[PDB]
Each structure stands twice: as C-alpha cells, then as structure tokens.
Amino acid sequence: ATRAIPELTKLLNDEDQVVVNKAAVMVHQLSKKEASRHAIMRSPQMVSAIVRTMQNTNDVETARCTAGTLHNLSHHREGLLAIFKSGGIPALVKMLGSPVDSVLFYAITTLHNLLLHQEGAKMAVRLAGGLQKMVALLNKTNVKFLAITTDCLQILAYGNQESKLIILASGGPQALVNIMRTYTYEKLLWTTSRVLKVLSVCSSNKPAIVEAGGMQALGLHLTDPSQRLVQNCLWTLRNLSDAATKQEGMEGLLGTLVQLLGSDDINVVTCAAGILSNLTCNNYKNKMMVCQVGGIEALVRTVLRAGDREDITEPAICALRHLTSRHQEAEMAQNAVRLHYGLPVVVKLLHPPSHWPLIKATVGLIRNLALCPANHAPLREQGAIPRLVQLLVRAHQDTQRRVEGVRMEEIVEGCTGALHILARDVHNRIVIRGLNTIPLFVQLLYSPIENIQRVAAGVLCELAQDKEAAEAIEAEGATAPLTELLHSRNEGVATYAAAVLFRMSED
Ligand code: PRO
Ligand code: PRO
C-alpha cells in the first residue's frame, strides 16, 4: 500500500520500447485503487513521466494506460491540481489527434473534468489549440463521447468571443448542425443546442449557422418531451431568425411554431411569436405558409391571451402586420383578424400602458387591416381614428420642439399612413375632418422626410375628393407646398400632390 513507489517512475521515464510500456500497465493498476490513487499523485516526477510518455509513445496499450491513469486521477480536486501544475493540458489536447477510440475517450473526459473544476483550465486548453481539436472530433459517432465534447466547447465558448470565432473558422457550425439532425440522444442534443445558442449571438457565427441548415435542424426538436431541449432550440432559433429570410424548406418549422403559440409556457409563446415575426418579415412564401396553417387565428388568440405582456404582444402584432400585406392571401388574412375577434384588442393596444415599440407595430397592423373594405366600419366603431390622430398630434409636437428605441418621426408616418388608408371610406373622412386634422396634414407637407410627405399628400388626396374638404385644404394654403412637391424625387409624393391640386382647382 503506502511505501514502495518511485521505483515504477524510473522505468516509465526510460528511453526503451517494452521497458516504459509494461511499466505503464502498473501505475494504471495502482491508480484503479481509490485510496492508492489518493496518494499516487503527490510525486510531480511521477505525474510528469505519465504525461511525457503519453505525448511520445507508439503503443495502444501504453497510451490507453497513461490516459486512463490521468482519467482516474482527475477525480480528486488534488488530482486536478496535480495534472494542472504538471502540464497535462497540452499533452491531453495533443492526444485529441489519436485514432484510438478509448484514448480519445479518456482524454476528452479528463479535459472535461479540468474544464469543470480546475482553476485556470479554460485558458490553457484554448492556448493548446483544444478548440480546433475538439471541433474536428465532431464527426465521431459515439454519443456519450460527443456529449462530452460539445460540453467542453460550450464551456470554452461561453462569454468568449475569441473562442466563438475560432469555432467558426474550424467549421463548428456545420458540424454542430449535423449533430442536431442526426442524433436522438437528449443529453447530446441539449448540450449541442447550448453551443449553438452561445454561437447564435455572434454576428459571424449566425449566418454560418443559418447557411448550414440550422433553422431546419433546430426545427426537428421542437416537439421533444424535453422542455430544456425545446426551450434551447427556441432561443437559438430566435437569435438566428433575422438572418434566415432567404431559407427554404421552412414549412415544418413554420407549422410547429404556429402550434407552439397555443402553449401554456410563456417563454415558449414569446419565442414562437418572435421567430414567426422575423421569418415573416419580407419573405412572402413564409407569409403564405403561416396563413395556411391557421396562423392568423393563433396569433390573435395569443394577443388576446397575453393581455398586457408586451414581450408577447409586440412580436405577435409584428407578425400579424407581416401577414396582412403583400402576399397572395393578404386579403383573407385582413378579414380573418376581424373574423376571429381581433379588431377590438388591436385598437386597445394603441392605449396606455402600451410602450412605443408596441404602438408602432399596432399602428402598422391597423394600416394593413384598413386595406380591406369590410374593416373600415369596425375600425371606426372600435375607436381607431381619434387615437391615431392623438398619437399623430402628440408625436408631431415631439418632432418640432428639440425616445425609447423609436423616433417620433416613425409614429408620425405610421399614423398618417394608417389614416391615408382609412380615408378611403366616406364616413371615415367625415370623422377625420371633424377632428380638424387638415391643418396638421398640410404642415406635414413641409416635413424633411419623404415618406411623411407621401402619406400626408396621400391622405389629403383622399380628403380632397369631398368638395367641402377641398375648399378647407385650399384655405390652409396647401397650393404652395404641394407646388414644390410636384418636383419631388419620390414619385409617390409628386403624384398625390397633383391629384390634390387637381381636386382643388376645379373651380
Ligand atoms: O411580457 C412582458 O412581460 C412585458 C414586460 C413588461 C410589460 N410586459
Ligand atoms: O410610452 C408611453 O409612455 C406613452 C403612452 C401612450 C403613448 N406613449
């Protein structure tokens, strides 16, 4: 037991074929006895012999035993301290190039244990080039092994942009995604999805992950019984989804997201809405699919259930906004919001306690709902016009006398845009006129921002079809600024300005 020890060292530190080798197959034996190991690591000359012969050997039984020895040692916070003080990490790492399974296995786990409990280990693995070696090991097939490898990477990448970028350069994205769409073993899916989550916040990793088919691979696991796996997939998907606009094969993912809106889980709902919102920005096929599986229905139920939780309603309202314009079934989707009792909650969201990003999104949504003639009347009846006008008036004031991520100039355009559309209905024009908005619309012709000139001239154009309003618009002195705008680089502005002008001088 306790006494006869550094005999076995000398032999390992020897420079001969069988001599050091068969001497290895002994400390291995001795390391296996938990109280005999708890004493073996005390001699740094003994510790270091193990390391050396490991880095420089040729024997499959030799390596196995030296690794295993270190494996077995890495269980005591004294073993760890010893392996560290000795310099195991560069050798262990160097061992990640070996072709003998059981050696890889011992190396990875030892590094894993060091990475978990040993002060200073993360730095030394990076310095040894361990990230690159670990990425290259991702093509293996034993799941316990990949679990441990991906966890090493997670531990190294977390909070370390340098490590994230090296992972990128070694082809991590592709290799981690292949894992997500190949295996079923929860523990490994979960840790891989955590590496991907850590990489998904990096501006360079994100497109690389999206190009490897990340969105679809993460999509595959959204119905797993494991809640931690689903949630991690949801967060990664969300971080990535602004970069995923050009991706195809999105049908299954899109369908599951809609279902997930039904969920009792708040973070589930919040992510599915935020993902659907992003994946539906600009890409009209995505609009099509989400409408096809009942997305309008689901998004409305979600807005109704969220009440005043803006982490939910804001992205759900943004999604609804995307789904209600510029695609083959926009029109059906504009109707459907009304048919599922959406109109009263949408107008409500214009009122406190709603914060600006929500209000902007909601005004945008109302703009689009108004393109549908059968929404004219209920939007009016629900109170949309007076609030829109108040939001317009207040925001124009804030513009003149000089917020929370949104510029009042966008509220001005959004509200004037919505009123432009609402103004196609004759009763709406009466309400808009009664609110004495004409002076404000005329002032908005002088805006520096073209998009504001456009909606202002557009809405005046709608008002000017009624004789009384045409008279009013003239009495505001609209002729002069409309006259300069006939020459706008923006053809939207020029065209409306001539329609208003034409309706005024019919006298
Ligand atoms: O969804 C939520 O929880 C946000 C945060 C405060 C207001 N509503
Ligand atoms: O966000 C706010 O504080 C106010 C409430 C209504 C208009 N904007």
Coordinates of C-alpha atoms and ligand atoms in Angstrom, one line a residue:
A1 CA 0.0 0.0 0.0
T2 CA 1.7 3.2 1.4
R3 CA 5.5 2.8 0.9
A4 CA 7.1 1.4 -2.3
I5 CA 6.5 3.9 -5.1
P6 CA 9.1 5.8 -7.3
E7 CA 10.6 2.6 -8.4
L8 CA 7.9 2.4 -11.1
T9 CA 8.7 6.0 -12.3
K10 CA 12.3 5.5 -13.4
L11 CA 11.1 2.8 -15.8
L12 CA 8.4 4.9 -17.5
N13 CA 10.9 7.9 -17.9
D14 CA 13.2 5.4 -19.7
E15 CA 14.0 5.6 -23.4
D16 CA 13.2 1.9 -24.5
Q17 CA 10.4 0.0 -26.4
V18 CA 9.0 -2.6 -23.9
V19 CA 10.6 -1.0 -20.8
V20 CA 8.5 2.1 -20.2
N21 CA 5.4 0.4 -21.8
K22 CA 4.9 -2.5 -19.5
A23 CA 5.9 -0.1 -16.6
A24 CA 2.8 1.9 -17.7
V25 CA 0.5 -1.1 -17.3
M26 CA 1.2 -0.8 -13.5
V27 CA 0.5 2.7 -12.3
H28 CA -2.7 2.0 -14.2
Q29 CA -3.3 -0.9 -12.0
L30 CA -2.3 1.1 -8.9
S31 CA -4.5 4.1 -9.9
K32 CA -7.6 1.9 -10.0
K33 CA -7.5 1.5 -6.2
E34 CA -9.2 4.7 -4.9
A35 CA -7.0 5.1 -1.8
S36 CA -3.9 4.0 -3.6
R37 CA -4.7 6.7 -6.2
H38 CA -5.4 9.3 -3.4
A39 CA -1.7 9.0 -2.6
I40 CA -0.1 8.3 -6.0
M41 CA -0.5 11.9 -7.2
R42 CA 1.9 13.6 -4.8
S43 CA 5.1 13.0 -6.7
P44 CA 5.4 15.6 -9.6
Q45 CA 8.3 13.5 -11.1
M46 CA 5.8 10.6 -11.2
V47 CA 3.0 12.7 -12.6
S48 CA 5.2 14.1 -15.3
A49 CA 6.5 10.8 -16.5
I50 CA 2.9 9.8 -17.3
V51 CA 2.5 13.0 -19.4
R52 CA 5.7 12.6 -21.4
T53 CA 5.4 9.0 -22.4
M54 CA 1.8 9.8 -23.3
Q55 CA 2.9 12.6 -25.8
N56 CA 5.7 10.4 -27.1
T57 CA 4.8 6.8 -27.4
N58 CA 3.7 4.3 -30.1
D59 CA 1.8 1.8 -28.0
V60 CA -2.0 1.3 -28.0
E61 CA -1.8 -0.4 -24.5
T62 CA 0.7 2.3 -23.4
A63 CA -1.5 5.3 -24.3
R64 CA -4.7 3.6 -23.0
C65 CA -3.0 3.2 -19.6
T66 CA -1.4 6.6 -19.3
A67 CA -4.7 8.4 -20.3
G68 CA -6.7 6.1 -18.1
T69 CA -4.3 6.9 -15.3
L70 CA -5.0 10.6 -15.8
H71 CA -8.7 9.9 -16.2
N72 CA -8.7 8.1 -12.9
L73 CA -6.7 10.8 -11.3
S74 CA -9.0 13.6 -12.5
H75 CA -11.5 12.7 -9.8
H76 CA -9.8 14.4 -6.9
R77 CA -9.5 18.2 -6.6
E78 CA -5.9 17.2 -5.7
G79 CA -5.6 15.0 -8.9
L80 CA -6.8 18.0 -10.9
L81 CA -4.4 20.4 -9.2
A82 CA -1.7 18.0 -9.9
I83 CA -2.5 17.4 -13.6
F84 CA -2.7 21.2 -14.0
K85 CA 0.6 22.1 -12.1
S86 CA 2.4 19.3 -14.2
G87 CA 1.3 20.5 -17.7
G88 CA -1.2 17.8 -18.8
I89 CA -3.4 20.0 -20.9
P90 CA -1.1 20.4 -23.9
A91 CA -0.5 16.7 -23.9
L92 CA -4.1 15.8 -23.3
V93 CA -5.1 18.1 -26.1
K94 CA -2.3 16.7 -28.3
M95 CA -3.9 13.4 -27.6
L96 CA -7.1 14.5 -29.4
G97 CA -5.5 13.6 -32.7
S98 CA -5.1 9.9 -31.8
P99 CA -7.1 7.4 -33.8
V100 CA -7.7 5.0 -30.9
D101 CA -11.2 5.5 -29.5
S102 CA -10.5 4.6 -25.9
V103 CA -7.7 7.2 -25.8
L104 CA -9.9 10.0 -27.2
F105 CA -12.4 9.0 -24.6
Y106 CA -10.0 9.2 -21.7
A107 CA -8.5 12.5 -22.9
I108 CA -11.8 14.3 -23.5
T109 CA -13.2 13.3 -20.1
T110 CA -10.0 14.4 -18.3
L111 CA -10.1 17.8 -20.0
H112 CA -13.8 17.9 -19.3
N113 CA -13.1 17.4 -15.6
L114 CA -10.4 20.0 -15.6
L115 CA -12.6 22.4 -17.5
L116 CA -15.3 21.9 -14.9
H117 CA -13.4 22.1 -11.5
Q118 CA -9.9 23.4 -12.1
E119 CA -8.9 27.0 -11.8
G120 CA -7.2 28.2 -15.0
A121 CA -8.1 25.3 -17.3
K122 CA -10.2 27.1 -19.9
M123 CA -7.3 29.5 -20.8
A124 CA -4.8 26.6 -21.1
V125 CA -7.0 24.4 -23.4
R126 CA -7.5 27.4 -25.7
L127 CA -3.7 28.0 -25.7
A128 CA -3.0 24.4 -26.5
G129 CA -5.3 24.6 -29.6
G130 CA -8.0 22.5 -28.0
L131 CA -10.9 24.2 -29.7
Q132 CA -9.7 23.2 -33.1
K133 CA -9.0 19.7 -32.0
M134 CA -12.5 19.4 -30.3
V135 CA -14.3 20.7 -33.4
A136 CA -12.6 18.1 -35.6
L137 CA -13.8 15.3 -33.3
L138 CA -17.4 16.2 -34.0
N139 CA -17.6 13.8 -36.9
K140 CA -17.4 10.8 -34.5
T141 CA -20.5 8.7 -33.7
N142 CA -20.4 7.6 -30.1
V143 CA -23.0 9.7 -28.3
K144 CA -21.6 9.8 -24.8
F145 CA -18.4 11.0 -26.4
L146 CA -19.9 13.8 -28.5
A147 CA -21.9 14.8 -25.4
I148 CA -18.8 15.5 -23.5
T149 CA -17.1 17.1 -26.5
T150 CA -19.9 19.5 -27.2
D151 CA -20.0 20.4 -23.4
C152 CA -16.3 21.2 -23.5
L153 CA -17.0 23.6 -26.4
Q154 CA -19.9 25.1 -24.6
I155 CA -17.7 25.8 -21.6
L156 CA -15.0 27.2 -23.8
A157 CA -17.2 29.4 -26.0
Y158 CA -19.4 30.8 -23.3
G159 CA -18.5 34.5 -22.8
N160 CA -15.5 34.4 -25.0
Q161 CA -15.8 35.9 -28.5
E162 CA -12.3 34.7 -29.4
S163 CA -13.3 31.1 -28.8
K164 CA -16.6 31.6 -30.8
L165 CA -14.7 32.9 -33.8
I166 CA -12.2 30.0 -33.7
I167 CA -15.1 27.6 -33.5
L168 CA -16.4 29.3 -36.7
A169 CA -13.1 29.1 -38.5
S170 CA -12.8 25.3 -37.7
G171 CA -16.3 24.6 -39.2
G172 CA -18.1 24.2 -35.9
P173 CA -21.5 25.5 -37.3
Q174 CA -21.8 22.6 -39.9
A175 CA -20.5 20.0 -37.6
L176 CA -22.9 21.1 -34.7
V177 CA -25.9 21.2 -37.0
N178 CA -25.1 17.7 -38.5
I179 CA -25.3 16.5 -34.9
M180 CA -28.8 18.2 -34.4
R181 CA -30.3 16.4 -37.4
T182 CA -28.6 13.1 -36.9
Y183 CA -28.9 12.0 -33.3
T184 CA -31.8 11.5 -30.8
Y185 CA -29.9 11.3 -27.6
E186 CA -31.4 14.1 -25.5
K187 CA -28.3 14.8 -23.4
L188 CA -26.2 15.4 -26.6
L189 CA -28.9 17.4 -28.4
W190 CA -29.3 19.6 -25.4
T191 CA -25.6 20.4 -25.0
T192 CA -25.1 20.9 -28.7
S193 CA -28.1 23.2 -28.7
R194 CA -26.4 25.2 -26.0
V195 CA -23.2 25.6 -28.0
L196 CA -25.4 26.7 -30.8
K197 CA -27.2 29.2 -28.5
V198 CA -23.9 30.6 -27.4
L199 CA -22.8 31.0 -31.1
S200 CA -26.1 32.4 -32.3
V201 CA -25.4 35.8 -30.6
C202 CA -22.2 36.2 -32.7
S203 CA -22.6 38.3 -35.8
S204 CA -20.3 36.0 -37.8
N205 CA -21.4 32.6 -36.4
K206 CA -25.1 33.4 -37.0
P207 CA -25.2 33.5 -40.9
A208 CA -22.8 30.5 -40.9
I209 CA -25.3 28.5 -38.7
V210 CA -28.2 29.6 -40.9
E211 CA -26.3 28.6 -44.1
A212 CA -25.6 25.1 -42.6
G213 CA -29.4 24.5 -42.3
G214 CA -29.6 25.4 -38.6
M215 CA -33.1 26.7 -38.6
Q216 CA -34.5 23.4 -40.0
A217 CA -32.2 21.2 -37.9
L218 CA -33.3 23.1 -34.7
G219 CA -36.9 22.7 -36.1
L220 CA -36.8 18.9 -35.8
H221 CA -36.7 19.1 -32.0
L222 CA -39.5 21.5 -31.1
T223 CA -41.8 18.6 -30.1
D224 CA -39.4 16.7 -27.9
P225 CA -40.6 15.7 -24.4
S226 CA -37.6 17.5 -23.0
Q227 CA -38.5 21.0 -22.1
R228 CA -35.0 22.2 -21.7
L229 CA -34.2 21.0 -25.2
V230 CA -37.2 22.7 -26.8
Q231 CA -36.6 25.9 -25.0
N232 CA -32.9 26.0 -26.0
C233 CA -33.9 25.4 -29.6
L234 CA -36.5 28.2 -29.3
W235 CA -33.9 30.7 -28.1
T236 CA -31.3 29.8 -30.7
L237 CA -33.9 29.9 -33.4
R238 CA -35.0 33.3 -32.2
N239 CA -31.5 34.7 -32.2
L240 CA -30.9 33.4 -35.6
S241 CA -34.2 34.2 -37.3
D242 CA -33.4 37.7 -38.5
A243 CA -30.7 36.1 -40.7
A244 CA -32.9 33.3 -42.1
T245 CA -35.1 35.2 -44.6
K246 CA -33.8 33.5 -47.7
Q247 CA -34.0 30.0 -46.3
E248 CA -36.3 27.4 -47.9
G249 CA -37.5 24.1 -46.5
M250 CA -39.2 26.1 -43.7
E251 CA -42.7 24.5 -43.9
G252 CA -42.3 22.1 -40.9
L253 CA -40.7 24.7 -38.7
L254 CA -43.3 27.3 -39.6
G255 CA -46.1 24.8 -38.8
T256 CA -44.8 23.8 -35.4
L257 CA -44.3 27.5 -34.4
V258 CA -47.9 28.2 -35.1
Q259 CA -48.9 25.2 -32.8
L260 CA -46.4 26.4 -30.1
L261 CA -48.3 29.7 -29.8
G262 CA -51.0 27.5 -28.1
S263 CA -48.6 26.7 -25.3
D264 CA -49.1 27.2 -21.6
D265 CA -45.4 28.1 -21.4
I266 CA -44.7 31.9 -21.6
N267 CA -41.2 31.6 -22.9
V268 CA -42.4 29.1 -25.5
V269 CA -45.1 31.6 -26.7
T270 CA -42.7 34.5 -26.6
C271 CA -40.1 32.8 -28.8
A272 CA -42.5 31.3 -31.3
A273 CA -44.1 34.7 -31.9
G274 CA -40.7 36.4 -32.1
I275 CA -39.5 33.8 -34.6
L276 CA -42.6 33.9 -36.7
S277 CA -42.3 37.7 -36.7
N278 CA -38.8 37.6 -38.1
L279 CA -39.3 34.8 -40.6
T280 CA -42.3 36.5 -41.9
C281 CA -40.5 39.9 -42.5
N282 CA -40.2 40.4 -46.4
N283 CA -40.4 36.5 -47.4
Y284 CA -43.9 36.1 -49.0
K285 CA -43.9 32.3 -49.1
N286 CA -43.4 32.2 -45.4
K287 CA -46.5 34.5 -45.1
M288 CA -48.4 32.1 -47.3
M289 CA -47.5 29.0 -45.2
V290 CA -48.2 30.6 -41.8
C291 CA -51.6 31.8 -43.1
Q292 CA -52.2 28.3 -44.5
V293 CA -51.8 26.5 -41.1
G294 CA -54.1 28.9 -39.3
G295 CA -51.5 31.5 -38.1
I296 CA -53.9 34.5 -38.0
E297 CA -56.2 32.6 -35.7
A298 CA -53.3 31.5 -33.5
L299 CA -51.7 35.0 -33.4
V300 CA -54.9 36.6 -32.4
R301 CA -55.6 34.1 -29.6
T302 CA -52.1 34.8 -28.4
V303 CA -52.6 38.6 -28.5
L304 CA -56.0 38.2 -26.7
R305 CA -54.4 35.9 -24.0
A306 CA -51.3 38.0 -23.5
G307 CA -53.3 40.9 -22.2
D308 CA -50.6 43.5 -21.4
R309 CA -47.5 41.4 -21.6
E310 CA -45.6 43.3 -24.3
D311 CA -43.0 40.6 -24.8
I312 CA -45.7 38.6 -26.3
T313 CA -48.0 41.1 -28.0
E314 CA -45.3 43.2 -29.7
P315 CA -43.8 40.4 -31.8
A316 CA -47.3 38.8 -32.3
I317 CA -48.6 42.1 -33.5
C318 CA -45.5 42.5 -35.8
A319 CA -46.2 39.0 -37.2
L320 CA -49.8 39.9 -37.9
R321 CA -48.7 43.0 -39.5
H322 CA -46.4 41.0 -41.9
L323 CA -49.2 38.5 -42.5
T324 CA -51.7 41.2 -43.6
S325 CA -49.8 42.6 -46.6
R326 CA -48.2 41.8 -49.9
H327 CA -48.9 38.1 -50.4
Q328 CA -51.4 36.1 -52.3
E329 CA -53.8 35.7 -49.3
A330 CA -53.2 39.1 -47.5
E331 CA -56.8 39.9 -48.2
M332 CA -58.1 36.7 -46.5
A333 CA -55.7 37.4 -43.7
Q334 CA -57.0 41.0 -43.3
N335 CA -60.5 39.6 -43.0
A336 CA -59.5 36.8 -40.7
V337 CA -58.2 39.2 -38.0
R338 CA -61.7 40.7 -37.8
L339 CA -63.4 37.2 -38.0
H340 CA -61.5 36.0 -35.0
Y341 CA -62.5 39.0 -32.9
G342 CA -59.1 40.8 -33.4
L343 CA -60.2 44.3 -34.1
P344 CA -61.1 45.5 -30.6
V345 CA -57.8 44.2 -29.0
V346 CA -55.7 45.7 -31.8
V347 CA -57.2 49.2 -31.2
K348 CA -56.9 48.7 -27.4
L349 CA -53.1 48.3 -27.9
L350 CA -52.9 51.8 -29.1
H351 CA -53.7 53.0 -25.4
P352 CA -51.6 53.1 -22.2
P353 CA -49.9 51.1 -20.7
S354 CA -48.5 50.2 -24.2
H355 CA -45.0 51.3 -24.9
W356 CA -43.8 52.7 -28.2
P357 CA -42.5 49.7 -30.0
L358 CA -45.9 48.0 -29.5
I359 CA -47.7 51.1 -30.5
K360 CA -45.7 51.4 -33.7
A361 CA -46.2 47.8 -34.6
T362 CA -50.0 48.1 -33.9
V363 CA -50.4 51.2 -36.0
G364 CA -48.6 49.3 -38.8
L365 CA -51.0 46.5 -38.3
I366 CA -54.0 48.9 -38.5
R367 CA -52.7 50.4 -41.7
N368 CA -52.8 47.0 -43.2
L369 CA -56.2 45.9 -41.8
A370 CA -57.7 49.0 -43.3
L371 CA -56.8 47.9 -46.9
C372 CA -59.8 45.6 -46.5
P373 CA -63.1 47.5 -47.1
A374 CA -65.0 45.4 -44.6
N375 CA -62.7 46.6 -41.8
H376 CA -63.5 50.2 -42.4
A377 CA -66.5 50.4 -40.4
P378 CA -65.5 48.2 -37.4
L379 CA -62.1 50.0 -37.1
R380 CA -64.1 53.3 -37.0
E381 CA -66.6 51.8 -34.5
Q382 CA -63.8 50.5 -32.3
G383 CA -62.3 53.9 -31.8
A384 CA -59.2 53.8 -34.1
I385 CA -59.4 57.2 -35.7
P386 CA -59.4 59.6 -32.6
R387 CA -56.5 57.7 -31.0
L388 CA -54.5 57.6 -34.1
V389 CA -55.0 61.3 -34.5
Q390 CA -54.0 61.9 -30.9
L391 CA -50.9 59.8 -31.3
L392 CA -50.2 61.7 -34.6
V393 CA -50.6 65.2 -33.0
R394 CA -48.6 64.4 -29.9
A395 CA -45.8 62.8 -31.9
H396 CA -45.6 65.7 -34.4
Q397 CA -45.2 68.0 -31.4
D398 CA -42.3 65.9 -30.1
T399 CA -40.7 66.2 -33.5
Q400 CA -40.9 70.0 -33.7
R401 CA -39.6 71.0 -30.2
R402 CA -36.0 69.8 -30.0
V403 CA -37.3 58.3 -27.4
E404 CA -37.5 54.6 -26.2
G405 CA -35.9 53.0 -29.3
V406 CA -38.4 54.6 -31.7
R407 CA -38.2 58.0 -33.3
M408 CA -41.4 60.1 -33.1
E409 CA -40.9 60.6 -36.9
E410 CA -41.9 57.0 -37.3
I411 CA -45.1 57.4 -35.3
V412 CA -45.9 60.4 -37.5
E413 CA -45.5 58.4 -40.7
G414 CA -47.2 55.3 -39.3
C415 CA -50.3 57.2 -38.1
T416 CA -50.6 59.4 -41.1
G417 CA -50.2 56.1 -43.2
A418 CA -53.0 54.4 -41.4
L419 CA -55.2 57.4 -41.8
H420 CA -54.4 57.6 -45.6
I421 CA -55.9 54.1 -45.9
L422 CA -58.8 54.6 -43.5
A423 CA -59.7 57.7 -45.5
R424 CA -61.0 55.6 -48.5
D425 CA -64.3 55.2 -46.7
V426 CA -66.6 58.2 -46.8
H427 CA -67.6 58.1 -43.1
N428 CA -64.1 57.8 -42.0
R429 CA -63.3 61.0 -44.0
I430 CA -66.0 62.8 -42.0
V431 CA -64.6 61.7 -38.7
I432 CA -61.0 62.6 -39.8
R433 CA -62.2 66.1 -41.0
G434 CA -64.3 66.7 -37.8
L435 CA -61.0 66.1 -35.8
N436 CA -59.6 69.2 -37.5
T437 CA -56.6 67.3 -38.9
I438 CA -56.3 69.2 -42.2
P439 CA -54.0 71.9 -40.7
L440 CA -51.7 69.3 -39.4
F441 CA -51.7 67.3 -42.7
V442 CA -50.7 70.5 -44.6
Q443 CA -47.9 71.2 -42.1
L444 CA -46.6 67.7 -42.8
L445 CA -46.1 68.6 -46.4
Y446 CA -43.0 70.6 -45.2
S447 CA -41.5 67.5 -43.5
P448 CA -37.8 66.8 -44.5
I449 CA -38.7 63.0 -44.6
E450 CA -40.2 61.9 -48.0
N451 CA -42.2 59.1 -46.6
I452 CA -44.1 61.6 -44.4
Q453 CA -44.7 63.9 -47.3
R454 CA -46.1 60.9 -49.2
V455 CA -48.7 59.8 -46.7
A456 CA -49.6 63.4 -45.9
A457 CA -50.3 64.2 -49.5
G458 CA -51.9 60.8 -49.9
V459 CA -54.4 61.4 -47.1
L460 CA -55.1 65.0 -48.3
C461 CA -55.7 63.4 -51.7
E462 CA -58.4 61.2 -50.2
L463 CA -59.9 64.0 -48.3
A464 CA -59.9 66.3 -51.3
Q465 CA -62.5 64.2 -53.1
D466 CA -65.1 65.8 -51.0
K467 CA -65.9 69.4 -52.1
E468 CA -66.1 70.9 -48.6
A469 CA -62.7 69.3 -47.7
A470 CA -61.1 70.5 -51.0
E471 CA -62.1 74.1 -50.0
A472 CA -60.7 73.6 -46.5
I473 CA -57.4 72.2 -47.9
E474 CA -57.0 75.3 -50.1
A475 CA -57.8 77.6 -47.2
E476 CA -54.8 76.1 -45.4
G477 CA -52.5 77.4 -48.1
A478 CA -51.8 73.9 -49.4
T479 CA -51.2 75.1 -53.0
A480 CA -47.8 76.5 -52.4
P481 CA -46.2 73.4 -50.7
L482 CA -48.0 70.9 -53.0
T483 CA -46.5 73.0 -55.8
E484 CA -42.9 72.4 -54.7
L485 CA -43.6 68.7 -54.1
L486 CA -44.7 68.3 -57.8
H487 CA -40.9 68.1 -58.2
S488 CA -40.1 65.5 -55.6
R489 CA -37.6 62.8 -56.5
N490 CA -40.2 60.5 -54.9
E491 CA -42.9 59.7 -57.4
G492 CA -45.4 58.8 -54.7
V493 CA -45.1 62.4 -53.4
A494 CA -45.3 64.1 -56.9
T495 CA -48.3 62.1 -58.0
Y496 CA -50.5 62.7 -54.9
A497 CA -49.6 66.3 -54.9
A498 CA -51.0 66.7 -58.4
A499 CA -54.2 64.8 -57.6
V500 CA -54.8 67.1 -54.6
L501 CA -54.0 70.2 -56.8
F502 CA -56.4 68.9 -59.5
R503 CA -59.3 68.5 -57.0
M504 CA -58.7 72.0 -55.6
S505 CA -58.7 73.9 -58.9
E506 CA -61.9 72.6 -60.4
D507 CA -63.5 76.0 -59.7
Ligands
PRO1 O1 -44.3 40.5 -21.5 C1 -43.9 41.2 -20.6 O2 -43.7 40.6 -19.5 C2 -43.7 42.7 -20.8 C3 -42.7 43.3 -19.7 C4 -43.4 44.4 -19.0 C5 -44.7 44.7 -19.8 N1 -45.0 43.5 -20.5
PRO2 O1 -45.0 55.0 -23.8 C1 -45.6 56.0 -23.3 O2 -45.1 56.3 -22.1 C2 -46.8 56.7 -23.9 C3 -48.1 56.1 -23.5 C4 -49.0 56.4 -24.6 C5 -48.2 57.0 -25.8 N1 -46.8 56.7 -25.3

